[PDB]
Design a protein around this nucleic acid. Structure first.
Lengths: 132, 419, 132, 132, 124, 132
RNA sequence: AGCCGUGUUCUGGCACCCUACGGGGUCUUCCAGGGCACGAAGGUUGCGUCUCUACACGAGGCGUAACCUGGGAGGGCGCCAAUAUGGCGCCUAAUUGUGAAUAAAUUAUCACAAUUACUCUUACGAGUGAGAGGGGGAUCUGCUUUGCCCUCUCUCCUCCCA
């Protein structure tokens, strides 16, 4: 799982944009790999983090955490660089046991991946419509 | 590919050490120049020279790649790593300040930097005949040197088992339910005919009515942990012997045939060998992902003496049974430290290290004066894993089977405790 | 058996700090109770152990013991694990003859309280000065 | 008495099986050399130990000890690791005087071997039938 | 911010010597990378540590710290050391950051700070 | 220092006999190598033993013992095999420090050899003449 | 001699079950009674603690650092017996320098002052080997031209008890 330039192709409403998160590094204090889209302003960039927690003595459960942050520009008609106004967050935490299995791990991965595309979650996040 | 080079997966997808790569790695040749340039600054024969020419012509050293291990035992012992660095020719920088005032208008004074020289490396040598003897006597005196501590440990662990048995008796009395019969152990500490005063209660006459028992348990289990520490430190025997070997470097000309540099280089080569011991079953596949810490060992001992504990008023039974179960768990974990203990690892190392040197300049009537300091760049270091031990070993399985028996019995005793 | 919550007040020199002590159990060996602050940390939780004895054979007078621990809880300690650096011991011991009185006990009790509240003992306990 | 691979042929009831025993380390604590089957696991199962105690104030009377030990094990239907359900073993003890002669010792060896080969001991062990 | 061998040339009072700093393990207890002399022994003598503390409940305000340490022996008889701390806000731009770096370097190479470091003379 | 057939050449009064000691083995219980003249009867073989003791916590000194054993035959005119009647002993005991040198200790060896050759020891051993 | 307690123990019962409504077997101890033995921190200093004294001061005991007396283990040496090893004896911190040392010079005994393992300047101090003790809780994807739990403290004739 070595870090490197991640290029998400088609994403968005109409599915036309693409994202290029460049490789920042890994905070070692918490074992967190990070990726950012190309820019200059730390406060104005789409960011993603991946972390892999092994079964601690007080946990005994494997954890994978993946976060995504996207800030709004709301650039003003002058008067300085833009200002962060809104911040979209997404967080996923997958969890297994020590005798976990590759296959059902990938199974859960793909299950959630296709759920994210199914029309239910579409209008559940898209239009904020309660599942109903 | 997923794991680093010196690691591999097991049956249930568990981190394990890849022996085939640890003990039989893939050597590779490298010729990475470190300081292929030298600088002379000063004046020689009324000529200020400050060029920067190369010195390194050709490099070749065999060595092994980078590897990672993981402890294969509860005590945290790591396996040894096969490493090689056998340069075809040694390397030593010389930051000397050559200078000499000769007659008839001949003076020189300058400083050299980043100037190295290659010389022969005596790789062919073996001190096995001198190292092998220095194991038999050590083993023979071992039991005479630590039998005392081993015996006191054996008695301490049995005393721990006895304490736990008495505690189990008290708990079973609690579970069955009785106030007067519960004092079977209470009479085993006061050293006196204690009489009652009123109507007591089960949990009241067990939560701290056994303070002497709790203190004894804490003390002697800390005792056992301390002796345990030393004892597992005692499962390793490393010995080495060192000798000196002076060498000569060929002639060299930092300048353009302006002055000769000669002398001597003092190094020592030491041959070392280290034998280890651990389990002979689970050493290859040791679950590093599921083990308890070492602090809970103190935690459980201090729990009953802690005067801060709310579970005594919610679920005494659960907390006490968990105490039992975790004690048994730690006991079983440490048990593997004494099952089928034999030769499991063995490394032999040969290393060269400089100590001193000498320099002598000779071109016309010994005109040069040298006052430099020597430093090496490349040193021969070869550490290889070996399994063939051509000599009587100290098989420490028979002398530890008793401890294994004791721990297994105590684990059976504690797991026999039910809610 | 002491199972009462004590809501203390006028803590510290400013007198604006307050504390609460909730029972934690009883030690059925020496007639000792236990009370602590609300929390889950040794340093952040202050200890109060009262103990009352009765004559049996070794002595012919009562004993009212009181041990209070006020550990200094440090916040920044390399992680979110507030540890202890300065352990605050406060040990009080009494001894009453079996022919004493509740009046006499209350007398010593109130005299102790008043001396503690007065500026007499404050200078010797906080500023550490001798009797000039 | 060099230690090396020992190939014990023509053995069993019909004298058709063969046993290969490699050496191991010699017990320094009492000077006992050991062989066991070629392995892997049966190495720690079957054992053959040999020792020669020379004379002393206790020994006079060289004493040659030869122990053989065969653990019979099996695997429960459902288990993985074999458990030893039985243990056969035998001990041979020669006691010779200091004035003994290689002559004498050798015929002793051969007589013991021939007796073991004779029908008498054959049925006396194989069937455990006493001589009658 | 890759960790690799750093060859600092033209250093000293007259800018002649060179320092070869090879990297080491990044301190996981606080996430700090380290470089040390070519060696062998001077590796544990000379030190250059680099860290970039991202915002936290006390930081806000990234803090990039660079520490240099030179012990002089003959047993270590003396120890010189320096520490640089750049505090940058979240809206700061790499333009600003490179401006600041380059300004600080040009100051240390300017006559005033050579005068105030080398001979330790206040600007008077 | 591998054990091996030691052939000691000219030997005795006139310097014409020769001795051939076969390597027996090495008692590891005390780390001592044993050599013995080729024969059959242990009680009437010339024996020699060498041991080297490393410096221990209660010794802290290099030790090396060389012991030599010479029984005499005194075979009787029939009536049974010979019986031991006399036994000559030699006990040599080198001891040095951790820091001593191969130089020193080779030198003191050859010193002892030359001494055993010299005329003084000649008549002090052979003739039993007190040194005077 | 009393008994406080500890140990030793036996009689009736406590308890059940059985027998038959005659009577018995018992274990776990305890209620009473009876048989028998027994009760001691070596001394000093110093610290924390329990109790009595009381203005305070002190006292007893406790746990303990260190100091001295004896005793033990190792203890080295020789004497040895038969090798291994068994027995006998003798012996232990020591070295250097200063006081006294005889009329005068040494000067053992005593006192006084330092030393203790190797290398490094012999300055301070540093490094390493060995051992002793303590704290940490130390495994997940670390290095390694070092082989492997981290760290603190103390010693280079020792360890143990009264």
């Amino acid at each position: 799982a070595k870090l490197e330039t991640v290029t998400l192709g088609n994403i968005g409403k109409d599915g036309k944009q693409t994202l290029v998160l460049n490789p920042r590094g890994v905070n070692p204090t918490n074992g967190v790999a990070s990726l950012s889209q190309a820019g200059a302003v730390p406060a104005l960039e789409k960011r993603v983090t991946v972390s892999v927690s092994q079964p601690s003595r007080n946990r005994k459960n494997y954890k994978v955490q993946v976060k995504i942050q996207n800030p709004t520009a709301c650039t003003a008609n002058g008067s300085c660089d833009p200002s962060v106004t809104r911040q979209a967050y997404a967080d996923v935490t997958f969890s297994f046991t020590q005798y976990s299995t590759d296959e059902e791990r990938a199974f859960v991965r793909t299950e959630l991946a296709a759920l994210l595309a199914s029309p239910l979650l579409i209008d559940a996040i898209d239009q904020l419509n309660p599942a109903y | 590919p997923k794991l680093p080079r010196g690691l591999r997966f097991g049956a249930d997808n568990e981190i394990l050490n890849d022996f085939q790569e640890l003990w039989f790695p893939d050597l590779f040749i490298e010729s990475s120049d470190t300081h292929p340039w030298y600088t002379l600054k000063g004046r020689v024969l009324n000529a200020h020279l400050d060029d920067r020419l190369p010195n390194v012509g050709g490099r070749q050293v065999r060595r092994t790649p980078h590897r990672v291990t993981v402890p294969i035992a509860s005590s945290g012992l790591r396996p040894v790593t096969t490493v090689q660095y056998d340069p075809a020719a040694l390397s030593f920088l010389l930051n000397a300040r050559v200078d000499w005032d000769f007659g008839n208008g001949d003076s020189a004074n300058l400083v050299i930097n980043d100037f190295l020289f290659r010389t022969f490396a005596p790789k062919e040598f073996d001190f096995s005949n001198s190292l092998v003897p220095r194991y038999t006597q050590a083993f023979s005196a071992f039991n005479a040197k630590y039998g005392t501590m081993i015996g006191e440990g054996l008695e301490t662990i049995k005393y721990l088992g006895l304490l736990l048995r008495r505690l189990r008796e008290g708990y079973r009395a609690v579970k069955r339910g009785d106030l007067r019969a519960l004092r079977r152990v209470i009479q085993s500490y006061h050293n006196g005919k204690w009489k009652p005063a009123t109507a007591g209660n089960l949990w009241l006459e067990f939560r701290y009515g056994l303070m002497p028992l709790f203190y004894d348990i804490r003390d002697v289990m800390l005792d056992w942990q301390n002796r345990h520490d030393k004892i597992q430190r005692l499962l390793r025997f490393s010995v080495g012997h060192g000798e000196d070997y002076v060498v000569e470097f060929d002639n060299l000309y930092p300048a353009v045939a302006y002055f000769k540099l000669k002398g001597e280089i003092t190094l020592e080569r030491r041959h070392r060998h280290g034998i280890s011991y651990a389990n002979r079953e689970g050493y290859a596949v040791f679950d590093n992902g599921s083990l308890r810490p070492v602090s809970d060992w103190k935690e459980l001992a201090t729990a009953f003496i802690n005067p801060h504990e709310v579970a005594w008023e919610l679920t005494p039974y659960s907390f006490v049974v968990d105490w039992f179960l975790n004690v048994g768990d730690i006991l079983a974990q440490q048990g593997q430290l004494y099952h089928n203990i034999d030769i499991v690892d063995g490394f032999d190392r040969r290393d060269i290290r400089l100590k001193s040197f000498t320099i002598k300049g000779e071109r016309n009537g010994r005109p040069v004066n040298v006052s430099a300091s020597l430093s090496a760049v490349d040193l021969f270091y070869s550490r290889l894993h070996t399994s063939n031990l051509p000599f009587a070993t100290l098989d420490l399985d028979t002398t530890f089977s008793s401890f294994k028996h004791v721990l297994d019995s105590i684990f059976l005793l504690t797991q026999r405790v039910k809610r």
